[PDB]
């Protein structure tokens, strides 16, 4: 189906000279890509956004999706906390930046425009136990320091 | 207080859940060990038992500290 591409840069909701995908109506400015594209060097062939890349690679299969994300989160055996988030970036297309909503309504003299203008009116275990014991020794010595200060102010 | 174990909620219906956080997630006593039943790894429980041990030694030391400091307060009052 020959759908229409969005005349606004889907990342910045503005019009210009933008690169559009052939499988979804999303169009993006040249600077919005991650990393951004050079307009002199346009890719030869059918160009798609990151979302379509993920959609065709995973082939819309939930089982393969869960398999790959499980393998990757296993690969994050040291950074597992941010694994779920980090698996979300490389699947979806980009957007521009706006500060959060509750931050906006803390101060009333700051205002927004429709354009976005804002104006004012293993070895790791050894190391961790070592840090444990060094801080514990420091704290017991500081407690004895408390006690010695007490004993000196009360004897003197 | 009472039980720490579910029954055998066997078959397909049971849902195994892998945590996203492995150091202070507590959640139950129905753990399942791997290389709603909450799976976990050996090194994780290693860390958690070290946490128990060191927090316990810290609070024991602090109890002795408050004991001795009340002792010193009641002595200096005399």
């Amino acid at each position: 189906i020959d759908f229409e591409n969005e005349d606004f840069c889907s990342a910045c909701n503005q019009s210009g000279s933008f690169l559009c995908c052939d499988t979804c109506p999303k169009s993006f400015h040249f600077l919005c890509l991650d990393p951004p594209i050079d307009p002199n060097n346009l890719p030869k062939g059918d160009w798609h956004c990151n979302e379509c890349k993920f959609k065709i690679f995973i082939n819309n299969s939930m089982a393969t999706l869960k398999k790959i994300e499980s393998n990757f989160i296993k690969q994050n055996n040291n950074v597992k906390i941010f694994a779920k988030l980090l698996f979300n970036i490389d699947s979806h297309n980009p957007k521009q930046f706006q500060l959060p909503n509750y931050i906006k309504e803390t101060f009333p003299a700051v205002k927004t425009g429709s354009r976005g203008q804002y104006s004012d009116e293993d070895e790791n275990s050894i190391k961790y136990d070592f840090f444990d014991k060094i801080y514990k020794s420091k704290m017991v010595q500081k407690r004895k320091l408390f006690q010695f200060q007490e004993s000196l102010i009360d004897k003197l | 207080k009472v039980w720490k174990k579910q029954r055998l909620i066997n078959k397909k219906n049971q849902l195994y859940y892998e945590p996203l956080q492995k150091i202070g997630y507590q959640n139950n006593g129905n753990i399942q060990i791997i290389p709603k039943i909450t799976q976990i790894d050996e090194n994780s429980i290693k860390y958690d038992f070290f946490d128990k041990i060191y927090k316990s030694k810290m609070v024991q030391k602090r109890k002795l500290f408050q004991f001795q400091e009340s002792l010193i307060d009641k002595l200096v009052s005399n």
Partner: peptide
Amino acid sequence: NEEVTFFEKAKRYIGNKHLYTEFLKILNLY
């Protein structure tokens, strides 16, 4: 350090895998 040696000694001495699983289950319950 020496506690890593504690747990490795346990893994070797208790010997079988299932019994070490049971040890760890006790340790986690506590």
